[PDB]
Amino acid sequence: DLVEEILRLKEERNAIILAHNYQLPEVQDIADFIGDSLELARRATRVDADVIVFAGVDFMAETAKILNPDKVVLIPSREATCAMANMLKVEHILEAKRKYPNAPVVLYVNSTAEAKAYADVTVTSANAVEVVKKLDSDVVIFGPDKNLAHYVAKMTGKKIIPVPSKGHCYVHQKFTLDDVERAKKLHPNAKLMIHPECIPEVQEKADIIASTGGMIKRACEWDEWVVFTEREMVYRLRKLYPQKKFYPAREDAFCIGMKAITLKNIYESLKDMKYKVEVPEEIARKARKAIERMLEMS
Ligand SMILES: O=C(O)c1cccnc1C(=O)O
Ligand code: SF4
Ligand SMILES: [Cl-]
Ligand SMILES: [Cl-]
Ligand SMILES: [Cl-]
C-alpha cells in the first residue's frame, strides 16, 4: 500500500522524513526521526540526505530549509500551519522594540520566517527558561505564546513582555481545571505531566510542568501519567515506553494543522517533489543566526 510506495520513493529521492511528535501514529511509524520542535531543529543541522520531507507544519519546514539552503525541503500540504505562529505579526515586534529598545527579542523557533529575522535568539518550550535565564537583561520581549511567557517569567524572575499580548496555542489553551479534576478522578495514582503552553492555573496543578521532550526525559520518574498536551503525544510516549501507562487529558485536544499531513500526501510529496519550501535569503540569513544561536545555547 502507501507505506511500501513511500519507502521506495524515499530511497529513490535520497530523502529523510522528519516528523513532529503530534503527527498521526501511522505517519510517525514511517518517519526516520521524530521529535519536538527543538529536536527537529537540531536534527536538521546533521542532514546528509538530499531531500527532507517535513511531516509537520509549514514554519517548521521553513526552519529546516533555513538550516539547509542546499537541500530540497518538501511540505506535503501548504495548509499544514500553526495557529499560534500566525497570531504574531511583524507590527507586534516593531511596536515592542520601540518601547523596550534594549530588550532581547526571543521568539518561538517556528514563528514566521519574517518574525524570526527580528529575533535575537529563538526558543521552544523545551529551552525557553534555559535561554532566557542566560540573557543579560531583566526585560525580555517574548512570543508568540503568552502562557509560556508567564511560565518563563515565573522560572526566571524577569519581566516578560508577550508579543502579541493574546498569543497562545489553542490546543493547550483548551485544558481546564475541570480536566485536571477528571484526570485525578479517573487515574488517581497517575501523575500529571502538563505542558507550559497550558494556562497558568492548570500549570499550577501539575506534578511536572514539562515540554514534550521533558515529558519523554522525565517519564522514567513514574509508571502512570496523564498527558496535558496534543493527544498524539500519548501514542509517542506509549511507543517509547511500552511498560508504562499514558492517558490523554482530553481526547479532543488535537492540532488541525498537524493533521493536514497524511500518508497519501507524503506519498504524493515524494512522487512529485512538492511542495518545495523556499525562504528569501535576506530573511533566511537573519533567522539562521537566531536559530543557530539557540542551538549553541541549549
Ligand atoms: O514541539 C513544540 O515545541 C511544540 C510544543 C507545543 C505545541 N506545539 C509545538 C510545535 O512544535 O508545534
Ligand atoms: S500544537 Fe499549537 S503551537 Fe504546535 S503547530 Fe499546533 S497550533 Fe501551533
Ligand atoms: Cl540525514
Ligand atoms: Cl515541547
Ligand atoms: Cl513544488
Report the C-alpha gap between 207 and 124 in whole angstroms.
Answer: 21
Cell of 113: 520566517
Which protein residues are within 6 Å of ligand 2, measured from CB? Answer: 22, 57, 82-84, 169, 171, 230, 255, 257-258
**Does the Cβ of 212 fall within 6 Å of ligand 1?**
yes
Residues 262 and 247 in one domain: no
Residues 90 and 58 in one domain: no
The parent domain of residue 53 ranges over 1-76+258-280
Q: Report the separation in Å between the CA atom of 144 and the middle of ligand 5, taken as the mean of its atom positions.
A: 29
Of all protein residues, whose CA lies closest to atom 9 belonging to ligand 1?
37
Burial 135-172 (b: 16+ CB within 10 A, else e): beeebbbbbbbbbbbbbbbbebebebbbbbeebbbebb
Residues 150 and 222 in one domain: no
Tell me, what CATH number does 202's domain have?
A: 3.40.50.10800
Q: Is residue 189 part of a domain?
A: yes
Report the C-alpha gap between 234 and 213 in whole angstroms.
Answer: 13
Q: Is residue 291 part of a domain?
A: no
Q: Report the separation in Å between the CA atom of 146 and the middle of ligand 5, taken as the mean of its atom positions.
A: 35
Could you tell me which residues are beta bridge partners of residue 194? 209, 228
Q: Which amino acid is at 220?
A: C
Distances (CA, A) of 121 to 33, 124, 141, 196: 25, 10, 11, 19
Report the C-alpha gap between 271 and 8 in whole angstroms.
Answer: 10
Q: Which of 124, 147, 227, 237 has most ligand 1 atoms within 8 Å of its beta carbon, as the pocket-test mutant?
A: 124
Cβ atoms within 10 Å, residue 214: 17
Q: Which amino acid is at 295?
A: L
Number of residues assigned to the chain: 298
CB proximity list for 70: less than 8 A, separation 6 or greater: none
The separation between the first and the last C-alpha atoms of the chain, rounded to the nearest angstrom, is 41
Q: Resolution of the deposited coordinates, in angstroms?
A: 1.4
Question: What SS3 class is residue 131?
Answer: helix
Report the C-alpha gap between 175 and 260 in whole angstroms.
Answer: 22
Could you tell me which residues are beta bridge partners of residue 161? 141
CB 129 within 8 A of CB 58: no
DSSP-derived secondary structure for 141-209: EEES-HHHHHHHHHHH--EEEESSTT---HHHHT--HHHHHHHHHH-TTPEEEE-TTS-HHHHTT-SEE
Distances (CA, A) of 40 to 2, 12, 44: 24, 23, 6
Experimental technique behind these coordinates:
X-ray
Q: Which amino acid is at 156?
A: T
Residues 43 and 115 in one domain: no
User: Comparing C-alpha atoms, which of 237, 232, 263 is closest to residue 17?
Assistant: 263
Q: How many domains does the structure of the chain reveal?
A: 3
Cell of 266: 507524503
Of all protein residues, whose CA lies closest to atom 3 belonging to ligand 1?
37
Question: What SS3 class is residue 45?
Answer: helix
Q: Is residue 288 part of a domain?
A: no
Strand residues in the chain grouped as ranges (E): 15-20, 33-35, 51-55, 72-74, 105-108, 121-123, 139-143, 159-162, 191-194, 208-209, 224-228, 245-248
Residues 72 and 96 in one domain: no
Residues 238 and 274 in one domain: no
Q: Which ligand is nearest to the CA of 36?
A: 1
**Does the Cβ of 37 fall within 6 Å of ligand 1?**
yes
Nearest atom in ligand 1 to 197's CA: 6
